[PDB]
Amino acid sequence: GAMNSSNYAELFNNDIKLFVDDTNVYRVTVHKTFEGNVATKAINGCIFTLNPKTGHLFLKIIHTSVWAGQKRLSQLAKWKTAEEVSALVRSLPKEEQPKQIIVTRKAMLDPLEVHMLDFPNIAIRPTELRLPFSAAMSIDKLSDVVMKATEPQMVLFNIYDDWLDRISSYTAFSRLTLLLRALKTNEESAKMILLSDPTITIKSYHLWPSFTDEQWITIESQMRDLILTEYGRKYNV
Amino acid sequence: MNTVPFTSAPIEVTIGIDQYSFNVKENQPFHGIKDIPIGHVHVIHFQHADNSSMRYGYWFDCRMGNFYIQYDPKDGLYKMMEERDGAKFENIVHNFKERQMMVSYPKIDEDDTWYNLTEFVQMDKIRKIVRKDENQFSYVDSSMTTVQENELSDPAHSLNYTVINFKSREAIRPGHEMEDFLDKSYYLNTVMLQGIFKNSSNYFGELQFAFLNAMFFGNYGSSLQWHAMIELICSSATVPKHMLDKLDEILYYQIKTLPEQYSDILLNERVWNICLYSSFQKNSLHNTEKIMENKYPELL
Ligand SMILES: Cc1cc(C(=O)NC(C)C)ccc1N
Numbered sequence: 001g002a003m004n005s006s007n008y009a010e011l012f013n014n015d016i017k018l019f020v021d022d023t024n025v026y027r028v029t030v031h032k033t034f035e036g037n038v039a040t041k042a043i044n045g046c047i048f049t050l051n052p053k054t055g056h057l058f059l060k061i062i063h064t065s066v067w068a069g070q071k072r073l074s075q076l077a078k079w080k081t082a083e084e085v086s087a088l089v090r091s092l093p094k095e096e097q098p099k100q101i102i103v104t105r106k107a108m109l110d111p112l113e114v115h116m117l118d119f120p121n122i123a124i125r126p127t128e129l130r131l132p133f134s135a136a137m138s139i140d141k142l143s144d145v146v147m148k149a150t151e152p153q154m155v156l157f158n159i160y161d162d163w164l165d166r167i168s169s170y171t172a173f174s175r176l177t178l179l180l181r182a183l184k185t186n187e188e189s190a191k192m193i194l195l196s197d198p199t200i201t202i203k204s205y206h207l208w209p210s211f212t213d214e215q216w217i218t219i220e221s222q223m224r225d226l227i228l229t230e231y232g233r234k235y236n237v
Numbered sequence: 238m239n240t241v242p243f244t245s246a247p248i249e250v251t252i253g254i255d256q257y258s259f260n261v262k263e264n265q266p267f268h269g270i271k272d273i274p275i276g277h278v279h280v281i282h283f284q285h286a287d288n289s290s291m292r293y294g295y296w297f298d299c300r301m302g303n304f305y306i307q308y309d310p311k312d313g314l315y316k317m318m319e320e321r322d323g324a325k326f327e328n329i330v331h332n333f334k335e336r337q338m339m340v341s342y343p344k345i346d347e348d349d350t351w352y353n354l355t356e357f358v359q360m361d362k363i364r365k366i367v368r369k370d371e372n373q374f375s376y377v378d379s380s381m382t383t384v385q386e387n388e389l390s391d392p393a394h395s396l397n398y399t400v401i402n403f404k405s406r407e408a409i410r411p412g413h414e415m416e417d418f419l420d421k422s423y424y425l426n427t428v429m430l431q432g433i434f435k436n437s438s439n440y441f442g443e444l445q446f447a448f449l450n451a452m453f454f455g456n457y458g459s460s461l462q463w464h465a466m467i468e469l470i471c472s473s474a475t476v477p478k479h480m481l482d483k484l485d486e487i488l489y490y491q492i493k494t495l496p497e498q499y500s501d502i503l504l505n506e507r508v509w510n511i512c513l514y515s516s517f518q519k520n521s522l523h524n525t526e527k528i529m530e531n532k533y534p535e536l537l
């Protein structure tokens with residue numbers, strides 16, 4: 001069924017699974033026209049497809065040309081997401097194909113179920129977790145590749161850097177979700193926390209800075225304070 | 238005008254013959270139903286006074302043979318049978334009529350209700366949905382499941398309605414995943430009408446039979462089929478005008494006949510609200526929308 005706090009360790013077992021988040025697929029800026037009406041201008045987007053056990057991120061960049069001349073773009077964006085996820089699973093060797101795909105928004109269920117009808121053995125599941133993957137475009141290297149794209153492109157990343165050499169995938173996912181939740185709640189402050197000390201750098205082949213184990217504890221504490229401090233000032237506690 | 242005699246009525250039972258019903262007391266001298274209109278299918282139907290559970294009955298067409306009812310005390314139900322001896326049958330019937338031991342099919346002359354509910358229903362198609370080839374009539378009861386229900390357990394006792402499934406390979410073309418799911422016209426017109434049913438009359442006949450099974454026996458799986466066949470049309474942007482007009486008439490008479498106190502278990506809120514207010518055909522069912530709004534506005 002649905003994925004929630006009760007079955008959270010299932011994410012880190014040995015059954016291949018992918019989260020799919022569609023919240024950055026169709027992105028627009030809203031602006032005034034010369035006549036004083038409102039119009040939208042699309043900007044490049046991305047599908048966020050993540051294996052939470054390994055950190056492997058399949059970032060399919062959605063170039064604005066895909067929207068040209070199309071209607072009902074927010075509806076189309078869900079179907080385009082499902083088309084691209086189906087294409088990805090079909091590009092993978094059978095032994096790498098997921099046994100479950102967890103969608104972060106329930107509106108993706110029927111689109112994904114229709115593209116993957118012929119795969120009756122891949123479970124398409126929703127979740128009750130409120131995961132912060134929308135904040136992926138606050139990761140500078142991810143935002144950069146999306147905005148620079150001049151055509152459709154798939155780019156592969158490991159969203160955990162080398163963390164799995166030292167920590168488990170449960171702990172890595174928890175760190176990732178903490179970082180993203182912070183970036184979502186207060187992007188400027190979160191980014192200040194991550195880059196305050198110039199001596200800690202981001203390797204060319206990494207997304208996040210090269211924190212020692214002790215520095216990660218400090219970082220994580222700073223981020224937990226950002227989230228709780230912003231939650232307590234918002235819900236009057 | 239044809240006749241279905243009863244050998245006797247040993248157990249107290251409510252007997253139906255299409256929309257009409259009457260109560261027969263234990264061992265009451267009831268010997269059948271006369272003046273049954275020729276030209277239509279009919280359904281006789283029963284509910285034991287002691288066990289309102291398992292309402293059951295028989296679809297038949299008197300043009301296809303001489304049929305009668307006889308209670309079986311072993312299997313505990315009223316069974317339809319065919320009498321092959323035409324002279325024995327004529328003699329039985331003429332005697333029961335002389336003794337006035339039969340109820341008359343009570344059709345009002347103005348009244349087209351049964352025709353309107355069975356316009357496209359043919360015995361030959363009933364017998365393909367309900368497979369028991371040794372009889373010319375077809376038994377149905379409240380508990381019988383459908384083929385599609387069995388896929389989600391005795392196949393001989395199943396309702397073989399045409400399986401409709403909106404998230405299936407049959408309903409969706411590869412490369413038209415979104416198009417076919419949001420506009421079911423190719424599934425309706427090519428897969429089902431041209432491919433499976435051959436014409437809209439056969440489609441409407443199955444839809445009407447599903448409704449009647451749902452309304453007369455509470456066959457849940459019949460109800461699922463009726464709503465699925467409505468939704469398939471309403472969710473198609475391209476439907477022949479004559480089919481939409483006939484569907485509006487079909488559904489109008491179904492809603493009109495539907496007994497008020499079973500509305501909650503015979504009408505699916507989601508399907509009807511979607512069909513009347515959101516679908517491509519939201520503005521094409523004027524008669525049905527008017528009767529629904531005046532008879533069951535709660536559901537909407
Ligand atoms: C939507 C969808 C349709 C089909 C389909 O109709 N296949 C038939 C040729 C057997 C296959 C896969 C799929 N994802």
Ligand SMILES: Cc1cc(C(=O)NC(C)C)ccc1N
Nearest residue numbers: 253256258452453454455499
């Ligand atoms: C129209 C009609 C319906 C019923 C009835 O019990 N229907 C439920 C199964 C929903 C009984 C007699 C009758 N003449």
Ligand SMILES: Cc1cc(C(=O)NC(C)C)ccc1N
Nearest residue numbers: 451455456457460501502503
């Ligand atoms: C209890 C309950 C029963 C039925 C049911 O048997 N319906 C048949 C008459 C079609 C339907 C819905 C429901 N909630």
